[PDB]
Design a protein around this ligand. Structure first.
Ligand SMILES: Cc1ccnc2c1NC(=O)c1cccnc1N2C1CC1
Lengths: 399, 513
């Protein structure tokens, strides 16, 4: 076993366990009880004060429950130990769950206590089952690193016997890219599956391919319209003004002029020549992402979402306000379900593009979120997140 | 016997080295009789003055503050406890008390050194007896945990040979119920006291055991029904601020079962009060409320226990502006639990938001008492809901719910036009307005904040306008407030505006830089 340690001076996690539904609980009991029999985990005593939250999630078009352990806090306190910019250009990518690989590797005996987690009981009628891992646990930032070596080895054959394929591993996931035809792809994918069995297997995302080659930026758009009323224009100027802070080349001078006087909102305004040309330019300026924004790997990757409606959402990934690394759209269920699906989607992209997960800003209440997310979650990782109060103006300025 | 839980002192810390307070020959006498009774029982043992640690003793009390300050943290003696409603009825239920509970369990051999203390001598250069604990000293940090923990470990066995027997472990007590006939029930209880005796754990016999109902943490527990230990409403004529606080307090507790308890009026009594002993006279509404509660209380209601086989129904009602009441049951009116909700999240809301929030609270509460969510019965129709949801900026979700026609139903008292209104006057506001029709009023406001000045303007506009208005404003603040379509507010101004809004036929609000 390789020695692992927390970052200097830091202690282990002591996070409370969010209450679970009987359903989820029994699933976990069933699961853990067999993880013990296989000596992967061990029941622990009161002398261990640490704790991490566990959850049961479901596998897609699969009939089993996956055990998800929120190792977020821990991963933050675990000692620190690249990324194919070619992947984001690949036509097809398939994501696999190489999570079970970690279970053949034992975990440094002195770190173990830190992986303590608890299985709750309903209404606190029983103390609650407690365990700690003995082997590398799925979701821990240490597990991939510690398993790296053993990984490269069993992966060097396919990597040279098929170097047209790009393979990236992030936590429990393997992102397999190529440019082949979607039929050739699914085949070469299946083979790697047994080629891994040889040296010993799931795919995340419905055995589906991300088509990153087809990911684009949602430019800011302007209403193209027949006749323009006073209201129309006011909205126009407003949108522009905001957008001007990003693209300084935007002028509203002429537009604002069609607005002098205190006219009725609905009054139609045929636009002048200068106005028409000013719009044309601004419209031209917005036709593309602003020049200059670059991905700083030393900074946090942030992701905000906005609810548009009708099952439509808008997100923007950035590091510095206004300077977006990406903007997108997501459209369908219920709000939450959709929201989770967006988060997972947006995270996967972040991984693929910058090999890192974003820090989300969510338009929902914690209690509600804490209550339902696990129902629609399927990813093996957990992004960080905080909860906000979206401004009516920002939703307006997107989509 | 039982395993030994490995203990450790906090890192970079040594055991307690503290001087024993001067005792009394009378108190020294008693300590030695006690410490000798104890060493013959193994709980303690004389040590070689090789040990430099020491913990103060007095009369037998041993002060472990210091040791505790130095002792590692343990897993929480879990402060989460059962709510009577999450229980399933049993025929018989036996409370098993545990004596010497703590003394019954060993202590990490490598830790006993740290539990040293000294019994002073009477004669100057004579003894000065030194000991250490071999068990769990009460007052010690880790006792409760190691104990619980260990206890748990013991019942587990018995528990698997008796999956019919349900056992709850709470501190030194132990609740055991079953659906067995009194006889076989009483039998197992001894089967149990035995299992506990094999580990030398004394529990009293049936003669002395305590009998039902069981008054637990403010509840009165039978094996088929439950309530909160009955409450007596004072009949004073002079009420102190403190008296009221206490009353309100008590009144709350009731709400989890007694439906109809209100305290708005009693609560109001606290406004501006200057001292815990100030006397406030009751208002007409306050005494009316007090009496109505008093009445409600007179009649004892008892809650039913959980029957997992059946569904859980939660039903909600609006009991006042900002007040909601609910009850969760499996059979009609066959309450498991009831409750209120007054939480206002935001300075402004509407019933829809509030009702929705009320649902979450309930939902959360259930996953905790029953581990499942109930099917809701709500005073609002999907169309009203959907309407709101669909247009609110925040993501939201309500489980399975059935509209129930129980007034008062919750509705949206007004809706902003989604587009400017044709041929409706246009007011431009910035405290004053200007319309396209030439009209204007620049009013006077004193003591008004910046934000509150904006809202004043809008109010004006609403005032002087007809049943259809278009209103343009640069205040993103106000826009937000109003666009959230609140129907109640902490602010008076708002409420006034709200009143306007409802009166109108069509209103359009727009913003400009
Ligand atoms: C205090 C307490 C906590 C948890 N469960 C119970 C009890 N006490 C009871 O009296 C009780 C009543 C009805 C059903 N289970 C009960 N018991 C179960 C143990 C038989």
């Amino acid at each position: 076993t390789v020695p692992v340690k927390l970052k200097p001076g830091m202690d282990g996690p002591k996070v409370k366990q969010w209450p679970l539904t009987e359903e989820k609980i029994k699933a976990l009991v069933e699961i853990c009880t067999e993880m013990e029999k296989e000596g992967k985990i061990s029941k622990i005593g009161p002398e261990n004060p640490y704790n991490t939250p566990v959850f049961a999630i479901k596998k897609k078009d699969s009939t089993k429950w996956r055990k998800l352990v929120d190792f977020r806090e821990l991963n933050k306190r675990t000692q620190d130990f690249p990324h194919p910019a070619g992947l984001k250009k690949k036509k097809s990518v398939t994501v696999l769950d190489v999570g079970d690989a970690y279970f053949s590797v034992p975990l440094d005996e002195d770190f173990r206590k830190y992986t303590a987690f608890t299985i709750p009981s309903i209404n606190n009628e029983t103390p609650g089952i407690r365990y700690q891992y003995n082997v590398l646990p799925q979701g821990w930032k240490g597990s991939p690193a510690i398993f790296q070596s053993s990984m490269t080895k069993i992966l060097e054959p396919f990597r040279k016997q098929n170097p047209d394929i790009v393979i990236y591993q992030y936590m429990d996931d393997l992102y397999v890219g190529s440019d082949l035809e979607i039929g050739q792809h699914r085949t070469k994918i299946e083979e790697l599956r047994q080629h891994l069995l040889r040296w010993g297997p799931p795919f995340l995302w419905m055995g589906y391919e991300l088509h990153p080659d087809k990911w684009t930026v949602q430019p800011i758009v302007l209403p193209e319209k027949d006749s323009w009323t006073v209201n129309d224009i006011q909205k126009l100027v407003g949108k522009l003004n905001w957008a001007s802070q990003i693209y300084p080349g935007i002028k509203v001078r002429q537009l604002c002029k069609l607005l002098r006087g205190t006219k009725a909102l609905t009054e139609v305004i045929p636009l002048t020549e200068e106005a028409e040309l000013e719009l044309a330019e601004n419209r031209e300026i917005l036709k593309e992402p602003v020049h200059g924004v670059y991905y700083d790997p030393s900074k946090d990757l942030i992701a905000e979402i906005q609810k548009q409606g009708q099952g439509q959402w808008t997100y923007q990934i950035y590091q510095e306000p206004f300077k977006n690394l990406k903007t997108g759209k997501y459209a369908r269920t219920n709000d939450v379900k959709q929201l989770t699906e967006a988060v997972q989607k947006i995270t996967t992209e972040s991984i693929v593009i910058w090999g890192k997960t974003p820090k989300f800003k969510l338009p929902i209440q914690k209690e509600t979120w804490e209550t339902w997310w696990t129902e629609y979650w399927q990813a093996t990782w957990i992004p960080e997140w905080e909860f906000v109060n979206t401004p009516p103006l920002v939703k307006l300025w997107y989509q | 016997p039982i395993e030994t839980v490995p203990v450790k002192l906090k890192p970079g810390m040594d055991g307690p080295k503290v001087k024993q307070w001067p005792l009394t020959e009378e108190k020294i006498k008693a300590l030695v009789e006690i410490c000798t009774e104890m060493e013959k029982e193994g709980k303690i043992s004389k040590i070689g003055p090789e040990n430099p640690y020491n913990t103060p003793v007095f009369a037998k009390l041993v002060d472990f503050r210091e040791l505790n300050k130095r002792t590692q943290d343990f897993w929480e003696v879990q402060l989460g406890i059962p709510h009577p409603a999450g229980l399933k009825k049993k025929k018989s239920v036996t409370v098993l008390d545990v004596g010497d509970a703590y003394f019954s369990v060993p202590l990490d051999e490598d830790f006993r050194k740290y539990t040293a203390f000294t019994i002073p001598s009477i004669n100057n250069e004579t003894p000065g007896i030194r000991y250490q604990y071999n068990v769990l000293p009460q007052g010690w940090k880790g006792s409760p945990a190691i104990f619980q923990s260990s206890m748990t470990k013991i019942l587990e066995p018995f528990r698997k040979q008796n999956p019919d027997i349900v056992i709850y472990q709470y501190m030194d007590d132990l609740y055991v119920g079953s659906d067995l006939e009194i006889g076989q029930h009483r039998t197992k209880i001894e089967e149990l006291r035995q299992h506990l005796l094999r580990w030398g754990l004394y529990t009293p016999d049936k003669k002395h055991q305590k009998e039902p109902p069981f008054l637990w943490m403010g509840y009165e527990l039978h094996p088929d029904k439950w309530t909160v230990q009955p409450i007596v409403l004072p009949e004073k004529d002079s009420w102190t601020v403190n008296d009221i606080q206490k009353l309100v307090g008590k009144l709350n507790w009731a709400s989890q079962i007694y439906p109809g308890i209100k305290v708005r009026q009693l609560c109001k009594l606290l406004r501006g009060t200057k001292a815990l002993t100030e006397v406030i006279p009751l208002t007409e509404e306050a005494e009316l409320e007090l009496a109505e509660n008093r009445e409600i209380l007179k009649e004892p209601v008892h809650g039913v226990y959980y029957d997992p086989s059946k569904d859980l129904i939660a039903e909600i009602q609006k009991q006042g502006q900002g007040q909601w009441t609910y009850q969760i049951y499996q059979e009609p009116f066959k309450n498991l639990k009831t409750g209120k909700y007054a939480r206002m999240r935001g300075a402004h809301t509407n019933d829809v938001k509030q009702l929705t929030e009320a649902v979450q609270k309930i939902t959360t509460e259930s996953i905790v008492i029953w581990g499942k969510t109930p099917k809701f019965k709500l005073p609002i129709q999907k169309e009203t809901w959907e309407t709101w949801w669909t247009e609110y900026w925040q993501a939201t979700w309500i489980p399975e719910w059935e509209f129930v026609n129980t007034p008062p139903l919750v509705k949206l008292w007004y809706q902003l036009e989604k587009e400017p209104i044709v041929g409706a006057e246009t007011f431009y506001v910035d405290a004053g307005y200007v319309t396209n029709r030439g009209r204007q009023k620049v009013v006077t406001l004193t003591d008004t904040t910046n934000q509150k000045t904006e809202l004043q303007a809008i109010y004006l506009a609403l005032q002087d306008s007809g049943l259809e208005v278009n209103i343009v404003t640069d205040s993103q603040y106000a826009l937000g407030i109003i666009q959230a379509q609140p129907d109640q507010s902490e602010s008076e101004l708002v409420n006034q505006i709200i009143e306007q809004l409802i009166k109108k036929e069509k209103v359009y609000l727009a913003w400009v830089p």
